Amino acid sequence: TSASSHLNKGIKQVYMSLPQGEKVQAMYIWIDGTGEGLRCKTRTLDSEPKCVEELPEWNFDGSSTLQSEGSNSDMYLVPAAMFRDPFRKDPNKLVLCEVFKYNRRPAETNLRHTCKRIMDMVSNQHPWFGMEQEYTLMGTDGHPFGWPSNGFPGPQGPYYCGVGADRAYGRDIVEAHYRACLYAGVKIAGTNAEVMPAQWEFQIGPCEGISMGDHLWVARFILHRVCEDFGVIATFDPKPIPGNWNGAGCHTNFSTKAMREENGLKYIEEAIEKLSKRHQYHIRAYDPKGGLDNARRLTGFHETSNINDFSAGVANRSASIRIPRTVGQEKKGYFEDRRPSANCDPFSVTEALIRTCLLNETGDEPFQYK
Amino acid sequence: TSASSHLNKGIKQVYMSLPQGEKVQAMYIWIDGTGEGLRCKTRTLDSEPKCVEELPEWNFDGSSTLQSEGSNSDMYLVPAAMFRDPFRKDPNKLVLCEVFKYNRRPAETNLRHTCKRIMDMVSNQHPWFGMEQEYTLMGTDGHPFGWPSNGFPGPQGPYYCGVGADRAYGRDIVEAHYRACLYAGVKIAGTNAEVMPAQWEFQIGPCEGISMGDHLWVARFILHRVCEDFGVIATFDPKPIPGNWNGAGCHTNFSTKAMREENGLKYIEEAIEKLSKRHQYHIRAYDPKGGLDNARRLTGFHETSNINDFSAGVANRSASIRIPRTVGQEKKGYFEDRRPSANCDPFSVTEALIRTCLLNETGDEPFQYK
Amino acid sequence: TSASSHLNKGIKQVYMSLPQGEKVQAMYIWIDGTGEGLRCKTRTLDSEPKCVEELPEWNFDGSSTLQSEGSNSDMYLVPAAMFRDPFRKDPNKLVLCEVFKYNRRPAETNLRHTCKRIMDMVSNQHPWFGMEQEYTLMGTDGHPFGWPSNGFPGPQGPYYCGVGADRAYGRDIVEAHYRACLYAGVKIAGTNAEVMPAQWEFQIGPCEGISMGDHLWVARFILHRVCEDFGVIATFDPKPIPGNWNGAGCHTNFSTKAMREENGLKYIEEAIEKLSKRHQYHIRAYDPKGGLDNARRLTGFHETSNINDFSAGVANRSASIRIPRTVGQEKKGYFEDRRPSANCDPFSVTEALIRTCLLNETGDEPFQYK
Amino acid sequence: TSASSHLNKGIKQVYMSLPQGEKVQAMYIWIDGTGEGLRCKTRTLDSEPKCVEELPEWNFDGSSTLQSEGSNSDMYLVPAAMFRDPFRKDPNKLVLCEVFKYNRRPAETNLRHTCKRIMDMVSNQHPWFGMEQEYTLMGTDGHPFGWPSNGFPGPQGPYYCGVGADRAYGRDIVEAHYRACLYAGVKIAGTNAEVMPAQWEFQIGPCEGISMGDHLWVARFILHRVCEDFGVIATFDPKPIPGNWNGAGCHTNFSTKAMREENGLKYIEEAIEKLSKRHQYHIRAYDPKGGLDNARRLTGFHETSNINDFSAGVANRSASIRIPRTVGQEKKGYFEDRRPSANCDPFSVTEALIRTCLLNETGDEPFQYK
Amino acid sequence: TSASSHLNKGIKQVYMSLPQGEKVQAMYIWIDGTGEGLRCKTRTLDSEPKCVEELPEWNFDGSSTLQSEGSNSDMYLVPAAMFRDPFRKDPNKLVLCEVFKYNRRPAETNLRHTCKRIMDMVSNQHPWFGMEQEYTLMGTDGHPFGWPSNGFPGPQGPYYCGVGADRAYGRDIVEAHYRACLYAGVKIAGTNAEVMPAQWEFQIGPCEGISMGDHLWVARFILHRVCEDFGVIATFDPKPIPGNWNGAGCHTNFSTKAMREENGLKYIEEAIEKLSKRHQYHIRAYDPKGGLDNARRLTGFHETSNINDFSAGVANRSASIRIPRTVGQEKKGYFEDRRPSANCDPFSVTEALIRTCLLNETGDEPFQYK
Ligand SMILES: [Mn+2]
Ligand SMILES: [Mn+2]
Ligand SMILES: [Mn+2]
Ligand SMILES: [Mn+2]
Ligand SMILES: [Mn+2]
């Protein structure tokens, strides 16, 4: 649908075929001032970097990305995680970088820095996270891909986990994204079509601590890039189409070594009790705009929790926190926080799960730790 | 967008697959009478040339390229640099050739010849150059690629270092160009999307002396050829679209062994003082038309230096010469001359940096040396 | 949408402008063997016919219209009613003709002949009828006009009696049909958009006895012809689109001089009691296929009576027979039989209302009268 | 852009040419349950109605228009005003009808009934009203007409009161609407292009009392119908396009005989003082959703009053109430309330101006009068 | 080419057919802050205005037209001239209005006010003016109408005064404009195709004094409006296409009663001598930007005077001022000033011809008169 997609791709492929030689390419990817966005730039490295630590720091213009004022626009990218590059193949890498200010203080959307400190405090207990990112592939026009033009597809029902031309739209984009994630090392755990047509879900898990955020952000970047080649645009909006068509939510699974260990459902239920008390804090933490975006998806209908009221159940698809029945039967496992929106920053959601359940924080403001 | 792009490219590829045998192809590339343009022609060589010196001299009709009068139209190409050919692969080569007149005097746009002499005088001090060529991919119609037809894209902001179908236009062309440069041996140091949509930057660094000009010219040639296959046209105009959309400028980094060496920021600042004094000379040297073109980009707005007034700062994105903060902290490094336009001849810009800073020249006219 | 519609209509108009002279054209229109269809043919008459009686009888091939076997295929058209011709203007006429068999016995779909006898028996009591024919304009593809392609329009709601490009589809066809009916002398009483998009209703009445059938059939013919010029196709199917989108039903209003006269609601309610007893007979009489077609529309949902169960109420939109509240308040008026399908033959519906309510018939078979 | 627009219009015109005869058509137009919408249906009248009183009452299904529950869905249309029909010409009429419930109580969106009572109380003082309705013509896709596809038109500036193909979009629709209003008798006082491209304003006035609302509603209906024929859709949304492009607001001019009479600016300023006190009441009254819609347009930028703060000035384009300088110089005249949104119900805005300024009401609830 | 042009025009025509009744429409047209532009708005007048004096003054927002600051944005339109309306026919009028500031001082682009005073001083001598406005019809894309796409038409030569599909482009627009001017009362004196393809010339003559400016401005407005209906855009740029294709210039003929009277060529030549002395003043007065625009057209090639050097000849097409040979033979007549650009404000050009030749002014600044 995009002009770029229309460009002959065979041509680009023959250039990709050419041996690149000793020089290696690293894409430096960083979160935007908006906080939902991702930006990227490429540098040439003389030799393949064995580890993320080896990769050099780089700088970018903050004013263009809306992360700083003109007077000291420069911002610094510090490599945080390194993944293989699906797009260019090995030795090329994709680097996720924390953004730092001109004065070397973590940037406003560098939520990894605070989250990383929080994960380190609770590293002994091995908190693990899984997330279930939901997205709709929408053409350049902004209307979902494959929907009739100036129209709506047939009644909702056949599209969930659908097969066939009519049932599923953008499977190729999904297939490419999934393989690209495997090649990159992003821990994709599976994919499924979603109830809304043209809407899919990709789940990353089980990552441990800060890794969850890194993997999801890289997965999202991979999705956007794969989508760009096809010409479609992935959207993480909580309610992509207004109406009865389903909204997109990123349901975070959370477990700790104690919960996973036998008779750990006591821990699962203790965590849930803490979550209920800080529900306002969680809703704000879980989406970039503080809950306006999350509220659109969370209408209390279409199997979504109401955003006003916290709820917990076992095998209750709708309630804000659902313990799977199997986890309950096993008396050990994980619970699924279903409040986070699709546009949620993973670092915030993980950090808030740790802060509320493991660090036992109380009150609206996040704690400051020595 | 071009008719040629519409031709089936698979067909051409099957011919490229055919083994070419012992014979080797050399593209002889030379600068136009206009001085911004590049022209090219191909010859068959019995065996692969090991070195540029081996390559034979060739001649071309100057009247067609607007480099000489009809009476003695013939001009001579002398191979100057040799690169591997990305388009046809090895053993084929791309040759950049100095243009000489019928009377064997360097041609008017053979600025390499004078520059090479200047580089040789200062070879002991190892001046190194980096440049940051900016360009906009524009369709055959002349309107930037991917912009709405008879329209303008959404407000400036999301496109800088952007990812996704909406944010970036012509990434495939950029990817192909970058790989082609690596294969050719052009020293590409990285690439980034630019603030304007459909505008990108490719940086060649760090080359030493005359090499900088050769690499950039070959890089530009590679870009034009890659663009031709896709059907888009790269433009190096200083202000490709008139209005608030950003102009394209080639910011030249300059260093010398002394500046690079510890406590070399004294040298960096001495060079800057000299640059300020010859600002008129630099502006004229830095663009083909003497500053009319450069002035359009350099309005003193959109983070560009005013073309009337020289300015210098540390980490001052806008000022004509910016020392990176990191270079200042290290007390050694390079400074970034930001006055040169995208259409600048690299040989002129390098030569003028040497002449002003290293040779300590004074006055409007360039010096004549024994 | 049809190829014929694409033909330049200005050209046809200049021929229509030409004076036709003394000769007059009469379109002879007759019901098909199927009974839902209408067919037509044109003859030239030396002078304008003042009355229907003057018009000459004509014959047609029954085998082509599926009304008789090959051995005695000829069938005879006897002019029954005459209307002015909207399409060609005066003096040209549209003639509705009863179809008679080769042996001069009324044809199987010549339901007017039996109905006319029934109306004549009850002529003293002046039964009047009103009908509300509903139809959907559907392109040559068979999908309703203006609906997205391979898609469905927005949720039902805004389209009923709608104004604006989005709300109403085929208003021009409706406007032309309405004016054509006025010119022809069809007693069109009004028009409204219907709940389903692209679906409209036209009301004919108040008519008297056999006239109701004649007017409706001519109105339908006019609609089909007007639609043909636009290229759309009108459909009288009971359930044009399968699903929650509304079906098309022709609700017959019925009154008699006694009911209309003050304190005539006793008569209205006596008629309704008789209607309830012969509900099976009515359902069969009211549609061509005996109730299979009617059943699709009459699901007992979307404000339609269930086809299995008779119901009567006052101002009960859904019940099979509704007395308007105003009629009830006035203690005189008409009741609305809502069981007849859009594809109903009017002659059958009127005849069955007379037979059940006025002639007080009992039993499945229609009575035979001396 | 709509499928209906693509249908040949010449054909419809030849049917319109046919003489319609004695029978006359009346379009009964009524406000929707939403309150922004308008719906319409047509009936045939034996003779032209000389006055609105002559026109018969009619009924419609409230459930389809979302004005009543299914049990007593019927609602009643009582003719309120009569206008000539531009679409079908004389003798045909357009009728604006108040909507009444099944129990004969004014419907929820029958705001004319309460307003009419209020106007009658103040009839002695002759309040006159003038409203500037603003609207954007937007294609079936929902993007404004003539804007580049998936794009934005050139910077705002040239389009206000513009001439030429580039400057003005949908002038034909505007021209047709204006003439149609004149023919109908709607008191159009002028038209101008608006700052946003594809956005126009049609001003109605000076009408007196209840007439103001009737004329505006009929004008809006005429606009929607004219737009439907062209295929475009008029929108009265307060902020049709989100961003710096201008929103659409219906600025109202209020005067009374006293204000108009010499040295009446004291009255103009007394009214303004009262308006300031009931600003919350006015904002709620002035738009259907209570101020959410109005707030989007009223950002306090682009020459619009902030919706949070009341402001008054003389010749202050931006302030909520502006007295024209000429009115101030004359010491007599009208003031312009600029708070009402484009989607405002006129009956509400007029009624609230009377209630606050003339009836001197105090408090959130509207008064109940014997 | 414009979307608006694609809208069915037959529909608009049927609305135009409707009788408009007693009310009359007046388009108030005024010059933009840029000074090349024209803007327009419509008002309803109860009765046809017999004279321009009768027409009411109106006001508009200066900030939108870039004529004043926000604090006192209001500007006032005072009707100056009245013409019949070709677009809506009689009684509707087109009004050209002088623009006045909030403080009632003539606006910056209200050059008529100063010019009118100058004409009045010399009214006794009856200066007459003729002008020859040249324009190119260019599609919405900005490339001249009928030129090949991304291409150039055949060599210049056949297009001047051409006939046939290949030779002339936009004759229909020209024909409509010419008739519209006749109907309006604009004094069109003729039309011819121009050397460049798609370029035409319309000449308004001979008007006296201030009338010349009024007629030309109204003619230009009529052209823009006629062009808008067709979808093309007229351009008055001095050099519409860069290259050898001809530029558009408005050659002003000037005469006075004395020059016209026998043996008046002495006066014609005295005026020319004065013109030569104030050549700098004339070049600045003759175009909006002070000569940058005029210089592009006036290259001293393609039969245009060089803008640097004044020249005068008899029957010398190229020289800045040409006396026609016939005028010279007659020893009486007019001379043709060929320096003014197509985008010239007529009021400025006339005023400067009067000031230099008739008022015998000397020096760069225009004189101030009691
Ligand atoms: Mn799940
Ligand atoms: Mn930089
Ligand atoms: Mn009904
Ligand atoms: Mn205003
Ligand atoms: Mn001439």
Author numbering:
A (entry chain F), B (entry chain G), C (entry chain B), D (entry chain A), E (entry chain E): 3 to 372
Published text:
Here we report the use of “Build and Retrieve” to define the composition of a raw human brain microsomal lysate. From this sample, we simultaneously identify and solve cryo-EM structures of five different brain enzymes whose functions affect neurotransmitter recycling, iron metabolism, glycolysis, axonal development, energy homeostasis, and retinoic acid biosynthesis. Collectively, the BaR approach was then used to reveal enzyme identities and solve cryo-EM structures of these brain enzymes with resolutions ranging between 2.69 and 3.40 Å. These enzymes were identified as glutamine synthetase (GS), ferritin (FT), dihydropyrimidinase-related protein 2 (DPYSL2), glyceraldehyde 3-phosphate dehydrogenase (GAPDH), and retinaldehyde dehydrogenase 1 (ALDH1A1). Interestingly, malfunction of these important proteins has been directly linked to several neurodegenerative disorders, such as Alzheimer’s, Huntington’s, and Parkinson’s diseases.
GS is a glutamine synthesizing enzyme engaged in the recycling of synaptically released glutamate and γ-aminobutyric acid (GABA) and the detoxification of ammonia. Subsequently, we were able to identify this protein as the GS enzyme and resolve its structure to a resolution of 2.73 Å. Human GS assembles as an oligomer of 10 subunits, creating a dimer of pentamers. The two pentamers stack against each other to form two layers. Each subunit of GS consists of a small N-terminal domain (residues 2–102) and a large C-terminal domain (residues 114–372). Based on the structure, the N-terminal domain contributes to subunit–subunit interactions within each layer of the pentamer, whereas the C-terminal domain participates in forming the catalytic site for substrate binding. However, the loop residues (residues 149–157) of the C-terminal domain of each GS subunit are responsible for securing interactions between two pentameric layers. Within the active site of the C-terminal catalytic domain of each subunit of human GS, we observed a bound Mn2+ ion, which is anchored by residues E134, H253, and E338. This catalytic site also contains several other positively charged residues, including R299, R319, R324, R340, and R341, that contribute to substrate binding. (i) In two unrelated cases, newborns were found to have congenital glutamine deficiency consisting of two-point mutations (R324C and R341C) on the GS enzyme.
